[model samples]
Target: AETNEITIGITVTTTGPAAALGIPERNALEFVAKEIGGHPLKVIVLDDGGDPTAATTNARRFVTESKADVIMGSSVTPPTVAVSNVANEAQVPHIALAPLPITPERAKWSVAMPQPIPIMGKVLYEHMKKNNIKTVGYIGYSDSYGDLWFNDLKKQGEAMGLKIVAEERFARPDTSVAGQVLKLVAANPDAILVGASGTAAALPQTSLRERGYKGLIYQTHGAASMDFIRIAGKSAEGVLMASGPVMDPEGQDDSALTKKPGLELNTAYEAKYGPNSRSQFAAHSFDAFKVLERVVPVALKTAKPGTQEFREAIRKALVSEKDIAASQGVYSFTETDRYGLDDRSRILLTVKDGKYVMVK
Candidate 1:
């Protein structure tokens, strides 16, 4: 006669610069929790203040103090990576909503909900190569996340025989990257890769346009937001970036599989939140909760209280899953490949008239 119930912890950036993206993710998760008919699944949210050290601190609190059965969320890569280690140590299954850098060294209990940046790099590289872009320059924030992508792209670019003209770096939250842009422009590369997120990423393209350095400007998956286009203005035009397939701006409706829960959810989200509600990361967060909705009940049914068995059961269920639908597409994960989606599945998008348009 009793109903099923579970507790899950969601780590997010309730504060700090990354909140622009993290707040929306938190909202989407709350929405999903509501959609589950107010089931006893309590989502314990811990604010990491957007710091990797804070992430570790909060993650431990979520595990020991909150006693969460499963964990989800993390706005940026570093925090997600840091929490992943904590979850692994506790033998807890974590469904990471952020696009953390996943190497073979990552913990077995951690599974990233979003496609990794390495896949984004491969997709962007292929797009540039197909378009006959021979020369490329790179500029990135000097943080661990930026450095990870910067190095990965460098290796991928060389293997594809793409000429690397310059590699410049900047610190996050810096108001100006004009000096770095000027150095990159002097190299005369055919395309430039911007590898930072938040307001920090805005300066390079804006500075480039001010200097009249007109060429193809490309960004990593993190730049897939309307704010980026709004801040960069005309400078963002013809800027190609890679992102997960969510709300297709090209008028292609969400695939039938993706629309299973109906369009009303997206409509209500837009009405309550804003236009950015349709982003791929938002959809990824939504999907993470949906996965929880399905898996939590199963875990509760099979797991015994006060033991690591519950966590291991959930991990096995997640890895064995296949053909699950979300806003991104149908996703499946294997033991070897922890991230559910493919890199080639990313959409190559460009900015036009201050909006994101799919590149044909």
Candidate 2:
């Protein structure tokens, strides 16, 4: 019986427009362990409502109020960055559920759990090039997520000889992308990539199809959820995406190290949430815990939880720990290289029959 518990405080967007991503992430925490390394664990979750300020507040509370040893969260990039700022200033180890741009200073205190934007974008661009597509149009959220993919397209897609013909941006809560789709249709690129996430990601494609623009449509791993299919309906068919292996665990070969854990998470999530409710968001959250489960033991060797020394040890362990298998994929973080994934973390997928299937 110990008086102090190892605390992990989570801040995620659970009620705002990005709830499709945040709710599953919050739900996944329900199944994490109550104890690790012979010490009691305390997990605290707060809803940031997809606002960066709210995420900052939650993270500050974790640092000053709850005395958290580690912090994770804020489901999308902006809020994730907000949480990271607080964690960095407080010197607590932070794990980001979304892909936020990392600098060396930021990397010293935090690591992103999801595949980096460049890796995911490269996969989509490769598919485009292989299919002989020469031009592309882009419609994405008017946020960092959109900027990341758009910039990646400019850097990688342009260098690969694929011209970007059109660019459009919309907010996550917008109901109609008709205006953007109309412009995209006029530009008439060979394919269009939707750089948004959650159910909101479906709006652009749906509007494009409704306007009779029949070119190929692609999406990012951010849109890899049942909610996208449900919201997009028939418009989702044949839409290609860059995703993590968790999107279709059973579709992965048995030899893949991620398959078993991905399957386990899918089963556990669907069992509680319902059939076909397995989400990449949930898997990202679960994988954060998987990362913690591996590193906390190593961190314990140097310092107990709740002290600044323990926080530094956790950050050190994160970089030193290698080949950690999680539902998404294997992660290996270096001090400056905080993204910690290679090609193994990526999978190309498509929407078929209202479900996500591995692209064959």
Candidate 3:
């Protein structure tokens, strides 16, 4: 604390409709700041209100004014990509907490928090095949997050013997998706996948239920926040997802690496924020800090913090990271794989009685 110090900047959408997703991310960082102040640390956080322009402004300030060694945040897809571009331009490392819709080459400069989309798709398709599901209907946001999952799910579904009978779209700010839901129901697929995030993700699910659809409904990890359950109410019951172990606390499919750390994080988070409060978004934020915690000391051996040498060192250290069990997934980064998660990062969970009940 006397001499060693590093500064990091965070940009999250804490003031918007996605506040449920971003506030928890900021809180997790606060917990990290207190837990590991082994070195002098300066953590600056700004709210972007889910706006990419605001995220760009925040990242610019972090580099030029705050002189941060690294940056983390913006909580959702679009804004996160905005910050990552700034990180690439400023020559700083960025730990992205959300899944980006861009190509791998574009995202090489930033590492993400969740299991890769293909991995998540593998889990979903495997489950569907095991249950004899042959047809699926999809309703997603008219945004990058939706496009990213739709493309991946379609590819995986085709390979796994599932047919896409119907596809529909909705905007995040829309209060209703009734027309989309009706169109999807007419297809009468064996299952439906809703690809959206946060509380707003409940719209399609609710409308589908209201339209008397009885088939299985699947949600992406984007709806892993407890706020989604609250918004969906009774209609959300029985919805399924391939999600992080944080929500599936007692789910048996997790690797030992995930079970131990997952439970510890669940307990710590629930103790502070109440039960079922362990959203996957918070764990992603915690893992972002853990990335720095595990690698910064090694970076220090070669160069001082706040210098270009240290920044580059942190990036390589992250790519080379192995053997660390983060709150959500066990990480092992590679030159082409920045998420560092596998099937172990995903587990099945269902909404039961308005709670996230792990599927064993």
Candidate 4:
């Protein structure tokens, strides 16, 4: 196994219900492979069909059959959690490309690239509290991701002395939420937290607006998209949400060089792949590859073959990295600060004209 070639495995949902997010994520990984010059570091991609069980099975295949040194991808939380356990048992480092709740239980061998659910909840709580909001209502799809945000936001609200006036839940594809919104409105909450992804989040917010519930709406990052705003129209106005930093350098107040790389990469990506390039998940994938590209050269220089020394070397290199900026921001990982960014690093946005306009 003493070869110059390094192989990495990538698993993302490509032929499932979440293909809208997964396909772009695949494009970003392919772009990273090309950027890293492709030959020495081979990428083996597998489709997980958007099932958590399937993801676990495929991750085992990648490690045992493909002999991948590192593994990446998995947009949804359940699949990532499932594969995280596998990677840990197999001693393969997994760079999770999505934002899942990074608890003490799951922090040993897994690293996440996005702002976690608790962080998002904290940001939402601070924004609402700063705006003098008190009582809030909650509506979410009954899934793992929705439950993650809901529980975190509840804890955040309790810490901030905010009252939860109402709570409701619906199935993933359910369209009619008028009954639920009416119940929440009857309690007279000052704001509403809608926790869902894709069409699940849109329907409740739309239903609430249609039923004349004029409270401020707050959504999680999963629901924070331009399409959501367009679907919700005036209803999405004054709505608050938290998400990863957008890769727009022109709108950034940071140094030009710090932002230029993302801009250039995004431009090339859009040109090569066309206009469907604005995905937060894709940005996370780009950062994941950037992490490997930066770390692999250092690892290969000092690593020996036919032993587990290389894996430990990569882990140590990752831990010592400081001011490691990417398409998102400077990433610094330690034993304690595992999410990579500090509290003030997150951006709060309000929907305006069908876009998430930065709110400073």
RMSD for all candidates, in order, please: 2.8, 1.5, 2.2, 2.6
Please write out the lDDT profile of model 3 over residues 250-333, one tens digit for every residue: 764454677766676678788998977888888888878777778887787787777888888888888776966776877888
**TM-score computed on alpha carbons, candidate 3:** 0.94
lDDT of each: 0.73, 0.89, 0.81, 0.72
Candidate 1 wrongly placed segments (more than 4 Å)? 1-4, 35-39, 103-105, 253-256, 259-265, 304-307
- Kindly report which residue pairs in candidate 2 clash with one another: none
User: 2 or 3, which is superior by lDDT?
Assistant: 2
Candidate 2 regions exceeding 4 Å error are 1-3
Candidate order, lDDT descending: 2, 3, 1, 4
Q: Model 1 over residues 52-114: C-alpha lDDT tens digits?
A: 898888788878877767777688888999888888887788888776766665657788777
lDDT of 4 by residue, 1-360 (tens): 654556677788777556655676787765665534243676778778668898899889877887777787686666877778777888877888666666665666678777677878888888888877888889986777778877876787768978888888887547688788879878868888988765466777788888888778888777644556656777787788776665355466656333654675577677876653555667777878777777666666677422366666677767776766676656777765667765534567787666667787
Error of 1 at 355 (Å): 1.2
Considering every candidate listed, which one attains the maximal lDDT?
2
- State the weakest 10-residue window (summed lDDT) of model 3: 30-39
Tell me the TM-score of each prediction against the true structure: 0.90, 0.97, 0.94, 0.89
